Amino acid sequence: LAVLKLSEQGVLDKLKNKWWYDKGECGAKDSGSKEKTSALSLSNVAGVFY
Amino acid sequence: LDSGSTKEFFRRSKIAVFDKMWTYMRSAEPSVFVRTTAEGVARVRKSKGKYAYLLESTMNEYIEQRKPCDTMKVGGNLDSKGYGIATPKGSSLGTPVNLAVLKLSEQGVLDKLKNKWWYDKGECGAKDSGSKEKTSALSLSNVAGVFYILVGGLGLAMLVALIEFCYKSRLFDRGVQMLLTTVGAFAAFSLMTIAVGTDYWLYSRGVCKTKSVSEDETSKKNEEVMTHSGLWRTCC
Amino acid sequence: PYVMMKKNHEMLEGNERYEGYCVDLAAEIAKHCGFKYKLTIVGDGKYGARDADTKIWNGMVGELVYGKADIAIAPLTITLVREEVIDFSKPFMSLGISIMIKKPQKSKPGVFSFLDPLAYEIWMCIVFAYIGVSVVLFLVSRFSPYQSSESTNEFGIFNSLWFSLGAFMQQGCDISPRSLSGRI
Amino acid sequence: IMIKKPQKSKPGVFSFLDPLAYEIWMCIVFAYIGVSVVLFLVSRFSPYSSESTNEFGIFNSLWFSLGAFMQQGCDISPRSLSGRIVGGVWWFFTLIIISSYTANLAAFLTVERMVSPIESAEDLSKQTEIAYGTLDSGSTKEFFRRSKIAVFDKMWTYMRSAEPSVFVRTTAEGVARVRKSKGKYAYLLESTMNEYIEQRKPCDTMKVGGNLDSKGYGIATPKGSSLGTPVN
Amino acid sequence: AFSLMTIAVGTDYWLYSRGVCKTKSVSEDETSKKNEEVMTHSGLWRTCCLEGNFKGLCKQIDHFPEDADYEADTAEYFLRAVRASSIFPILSVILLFMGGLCIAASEFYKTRHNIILSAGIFFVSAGLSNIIGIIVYISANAGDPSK
Amino acid sequence: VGGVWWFFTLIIISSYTANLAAFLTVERMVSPIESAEDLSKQTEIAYGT
Amino acid sequence: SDSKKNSYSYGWSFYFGALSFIIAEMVGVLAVHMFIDRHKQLTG
Numbered sequence A: 001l002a003v004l005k006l007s008e009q010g011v012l013d014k015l016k017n018k019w020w021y022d023k024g025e026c027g028a029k030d031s032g033s034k035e036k037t038s039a040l041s042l043s044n045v046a047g048v049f050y
Numbered sequence B: 001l002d003s004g005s006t007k008e009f010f011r012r013s014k015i016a017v018f019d020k021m022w023t024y025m026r027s028a029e030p031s032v033f034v035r036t037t038a039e040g041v042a043r044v045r046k047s048k049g050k051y052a053y054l055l056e057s058t059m060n061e062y063i064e065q066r067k068p069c070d071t072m073k074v075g076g077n078l079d080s081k082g083y084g085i086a087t088p089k090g091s092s093l094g095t096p097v098n099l100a101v102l103k104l105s106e107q108g109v110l111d112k113l114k115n116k117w118w119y120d121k122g123e124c125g126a127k128d129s130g131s132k133e134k135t136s137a138l139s140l141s142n143v144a145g146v147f148y149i150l151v152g153g154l155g156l157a158m159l160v161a162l163i164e165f166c167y168k169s170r171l172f173d174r175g176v177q178m179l180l181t182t183v184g185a186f187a188a189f190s191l192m193t194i195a196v197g198t199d200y201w202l203y204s205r206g207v208c209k210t211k212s213v214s215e216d217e218t219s220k221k222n223e224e225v226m227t228h229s230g231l232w233r234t235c236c
Numbered sequence C: 001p002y003v004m005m006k007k008n009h010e011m012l013e014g015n016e017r018y019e020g021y022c023v024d025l026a027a028e029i030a031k032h033c034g035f036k037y038k039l040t041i042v043g044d045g046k047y048g049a050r051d052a053d054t055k056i057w058n059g060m061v062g063e064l065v066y067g068k069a070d071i072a073i074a075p076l077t078i079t080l081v082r083e084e085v086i087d088f089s090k091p092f093m094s095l096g097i098s099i100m101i102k103k104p105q106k107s108k109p110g111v112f113s114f115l116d117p118l119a120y121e122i123w124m125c126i127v128f129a130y131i132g133v134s135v136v137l138f139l140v141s142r143f144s145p146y147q148s149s150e151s152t153n154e155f156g157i158f159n160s161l162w163f164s165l166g167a168f169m170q171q172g173c174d175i176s177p178r179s180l181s182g183r184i
Numbered sequence D: 001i002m003i004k005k006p007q008k009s010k011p012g013v014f015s016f017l018d019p020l021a022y023e024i025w026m027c028i029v030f031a032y033i034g035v036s037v038v039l040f041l042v043s044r045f046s047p048y049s050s051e052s053t054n055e056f057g058i059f060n061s062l063w064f065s066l067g068a069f070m071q072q073g074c075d076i077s078p079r080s081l082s083g084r085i086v087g088g089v090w091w092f093f094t095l096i097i098i099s100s101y102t103a104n105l106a107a108f109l110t111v112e113r114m115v116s117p118i119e120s121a122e123d124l125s126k127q128t129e130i131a132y133g134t135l136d137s138g139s140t141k142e143f144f145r146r147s148k149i150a151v152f153d154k155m156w157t158y159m160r161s162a163e164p165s166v167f168v169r170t171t172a173e174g175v176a177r178v179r180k181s182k183g184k185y186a187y188l189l190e191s192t193m194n195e196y197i198e199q200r201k202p203c204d205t206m207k208v209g210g211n212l213d214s215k216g217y218g219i220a221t222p223k224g225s226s227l228g229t230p231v232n
Numbered sequence E: 001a002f003s004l005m006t007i008a009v010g011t012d013y014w015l016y017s018r019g020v021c022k023t024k025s026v027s028e029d030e031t032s033k034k035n036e037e038v039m040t041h042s043g044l045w046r047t048c049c050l051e052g053n054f055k056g057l058c059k060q061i062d063h064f065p066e067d068a069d070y071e072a073d074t075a076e077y078f079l080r081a082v083r084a085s086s087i088f089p090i091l092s093v094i095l096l097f098m099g100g101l102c103i104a105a106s107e108f109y110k111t112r113h114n115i116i117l118s119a120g121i122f123f124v125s126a127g128l129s130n131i132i133g134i135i136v137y138i139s140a141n142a143g144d145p146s147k
Numbered sequence F: 001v002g003g004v005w006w007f008f009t010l011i012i013i014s015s016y017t018a019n020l021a022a023f024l025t026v027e028r029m030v031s032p033i034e035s036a037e038d039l040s041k042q043t044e045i046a047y048g049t
Numbered sequence G: 001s002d003s004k005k006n007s008y009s010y011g012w013s014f015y016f017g018a019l020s021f022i023i024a025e026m027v028g029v030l031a032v033h034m035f036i037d038r039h040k041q042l043t044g
């Protein structure tokens, strides 16, 4: 009954999401580049400007 | 929904995000609550993205796999719930029914039956149209702006030629040039000092006084808010 | 798709009347445990809720409490008040509240789509670099060559603009620098 | 697996005119003519023999735009400010159009296969858009119902729910059922029959993937037949 | 050329396609069976079908629909309003008429010497309006192509 | 004459430089000998038994 | 990749630095023209 009560108050959720996400000081970066190909960046060509 | 488990959870929600949703729902006209779920599905489709519906994930997946395939599930699970087989107290088969659920889960038959009925018996079956990869000829509309710029460049060229022809049918001075050069030099120095000195270079999400101390973890830290970062300073 | 009426359900009778995922699940729970099962659809068609003043579980939870129904292989969420009276299984399938939007119609009539592969920063830097190269070339050439040698070259500031643009557009230009720093 | 062949479309002598739509080729010629006319109009306004200083006649102006469009370049160069305006905009127009043609032409040169046909029976299983049938009272049909390979069992499942009935009566009818559906439908039979029929007319069939199993055809005698051992 | 442009405006044979004819001109029609969309001579404003049971009848195109399947895009809204209110082809005809006035008065109004010059400007400016009216017509036909 | 030659050279070079990089870094095997009848008509590659 | 969540926007300070660039290039060209007249005056 205790586990059910915490789940219906989100206490299981609140404890879980607080510990995992906030101790993630490292950026998650599961995304990276979601699209396969993307526009040119200034960083790829900034030396030519220099 | 007008009356449902979704209705009750956001009532019980203490999250500020969910409460702001819940404040909108109590005070929005036309009434955002719908009498039945099938009504809300038709209402979202009729309202063309201006109205969106909150419903359970398995229902939303089912609506997508049917036709006219015109609804999209987005987001993650707001909260987690479960579907449990119900048996009365002192159930004769109740514990073996639990063991039967565990066996079908571990054998994967629960998911295999689940993955079949939603994604194959569904009319849409969008894997086929999603697998369409065909390069094509460019259309005119794909490059239509380039044609527009050419025409606009043509008409501008005519207009400049006409006004130049009028002006030729009708004298720059050196002292005027010296005065203009003095004014330009003072202004360009002024613009450059303001730009480097005052700090409004970038408007983006950035770290403010909620985490002005970078060292303090301060659990959620209010992730990062709008920030007028600049060359010498970062400010929110 | 938990329970489904087929176009031949009018023909079919008994357990064969209804099909679906939970109907499959009812059949699967049957063969593991070993019980003959009778499929019924409740008339109220509402999820189990204890009422305000009659205080009767409405629908499937009432029929299990009141002995009529033996089991509920049904899309029934586990709540506190329901679990308190009758025991549930561990949840066979999970659910979450989800957002549904009408699918946004997809096309890019991009009209200025030609300047898409380079970002607008890069276009801005090119225009600044275009103006810089044109000015430097004019400053290089008309930097006191020595009457005539001042006026020998055709690279004025207006011509210096034109030279660099044709060079950028991969188009041949009429004039050529003919000075060492200018040719650099 | 027996499916209908894809079309080996024979491109005409104007295959180069493929990356741009024929409307665009019309629009380019129309834009070519207008710019050349405008540039001649710009070059000759009777300025204030000042018009004679410009070398741009219409025939020069046709010539300048063509060298711009073909990117080869021309000797003459516009020297009036509006004359430089029309040229530079047309240069910017050309730069997009020619490059977009070469980029798409490179894309059309890169041709690849297996996208339009079905890769194998797992790809038949992944999409029921191309349905499939088996021969009536055949060992082929009896194999798929009794082979518990997971692709085969899902393939037997759609065989159970298939309308109109994918099973055919004879071999030639099932062959004809591939043809009559215009590539929207596939069929299953033995490899040796399929190899003969694909080498016969109207030569519009081919075998995707490979044979899923290996089997044999043997001379058949009754159980305990006296002639069983000599025919062995 | 003024005559050619006016006949072009005043006709409905711009595009031939398998478009909706008068049987499905009535919206949400029942038991028409979609009528298999016989040939339609689309026009500058007219959606009249040809070679049909219901040819000979003319209805104007209404490019703005009752129901917008896509969410209303501002740049597309501008482009449609250009095509429906076909002001660029209309302005072309006017500039053709203005040059034709200048051509008629070119013999008269001596010592201006710029009437013929004003005619040539009008002739090019009419021609520029023709191309952009052509382009939006191709762009509109590309917009919602079909199946 | 120059115009038609200019249209010619545009098509040919764009065709030539379409996928030119892919025809300098193909390292694929020649595999000159294929079948038995191909093995039969030559003696330079010997038969082993 | 587009940093749409970051939604980076170049404020008025960034535009003014661009304006400082454009004016300074214009002033430099005008300055050279004044020299060319004066250097031509020196020849005369």
Ligand SMILES: NS(=O)(=O)c1cc2c(cc1Cl)N[C@H]([C@H]1C[C@H]3C=C[C@@H]1C3)NS2(=O)=O
Binding pocket: B082, B083, B102, B105, B106, B108, B109, B110, B111, B112, B114, C090, C091, C092, C093, C094
């Ligand atoms: N994919 S599914 O619906 O078949 C499915 C659904 C669920 C599974 C396992 C599967 Cl395979 N695990 C849990 C249950 C299985 C055991 C582990 C946790 C409980 C007991 N319930 S669930 O979260 O409802």
Ligand SMILES: N[C@@H](CCC(=O)O)C(=O)O
Binding pocket: D135, D136, D137, D138, D139, D140, D141, D189, D190
């Ligand atoms: N050899 C097969 C031929 C028919 C079939 O492939 O179904 C048989 O006798 O069954």
